[PDB]
């Protein structure tokens, strides 16, 4: 590697130009790959948040549903007693409160549906980020290694470091 070699200078300059071209090319793909990787990561986290939140909706809905079973079974008793004493005001109030509970359940079920549909769209963006990334990777890797094949060859012919920096410089 280190010390200066006994080979034609013409061959070294041509290989050095190629190192340069292949480093530029590799760098371009890598920059491209990384921008996507950043959006890939943020998308993956948001997706994981949405799955958890769907689960919490599922469980929230169970609880409000159980509340519904509680009210039909507690107000079974008292409604039958009440229209015997003619209190249609208090029956009205119980029914109003019940309408409120069912209304809120349906708002929650609606919110879950929305999030399911947004998870569906975002999971698709995610798949498309992945396909773009997969299309680049093999290219990124192959350019890098050709760049390495040339770098190491030049390093081995004792080429000065300031000359290798000029070629890697862009």
């Amino acid at each position: 590697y280190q010390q200066d070699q006994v080979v034609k200078e013409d061959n070294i300059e041509a290989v050095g130009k190629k190192l340069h071209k292949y480093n530029t090319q590799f760098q371009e793909k890598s920059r491209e790959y990384d921008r996507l990787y950043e959006e890939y990561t943020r998308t993956s986290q948001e997706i994981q948040m949405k799955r958890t939140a769907i689960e919490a909706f599922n469980e929230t809905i169970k609880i409000f549903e159980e509340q519904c079973q509680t009210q039909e079974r507690y107000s079974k008793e008292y409604i039958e007693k009440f229209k015997r004493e003619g209190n249609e005001k208090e029956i009205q109030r119980i029914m109003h409160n019940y309408d409120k509970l069912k209304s809120r359940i349906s708002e929650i079920i609606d919110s879950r549906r929305r999030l399911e549909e947004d998870l569906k769209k975002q999971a698709a963006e995610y798949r498309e980020i992945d396909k773009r990334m997969n299309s680049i990777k093999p290219d990124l890797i192959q350019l890098r290694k050709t760049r390495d094949q040339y770098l190491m060859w030049l390093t081995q012919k004792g080429v000065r470091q300031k000359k290798l920096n000029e070629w890697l410089g862009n």
Binding site: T52, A53, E55, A56, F57, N58, E59, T60, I63, F64, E66, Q67, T70, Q71, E72, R73, Y74, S75, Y78, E90, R93, I94, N97, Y98, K100, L101, R104, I108
Partner: protein, 90 residues
């Protein structure tokens, strides 16, 4: 969680009541406000003393939690949604 927030409480007589809370309030003072507020609602005679009851809710991690430690503050509970179901743990 802004300074004061609406918390939906699900009473064991079937009733829903909406209650304004200081985000900082402990569950024990909220249980207290709640059972005062319940008397303004139907079927308030079916309620035992407030101390027989415990709150249940869902955390942001989607787990169902029973809050036996009522000194805990409403803002530290990590509620998915501002509601509390009231149960006799039996």
């Amino acid at each position: 969680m802004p300074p004061r927030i609406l918390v939906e409480c699900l009473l064991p007589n079937g009733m829903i009541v909406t209650l304004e809370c200081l985000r900082e309030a402990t569950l024990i003072t909220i249980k207290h406000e709640l059972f005062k507020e319940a008397r303004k609602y139907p079927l308030h005679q079916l309620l035992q003393d407030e101390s027989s009851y415990i709150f249940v809710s869902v955390t942001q991690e989607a787990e169902r939690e029973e809050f036996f430690d009522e000194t805990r503050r409403l803002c530290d509970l990590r509620l998915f949604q501002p509601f509390l179901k009231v149960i006799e743990p039996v």
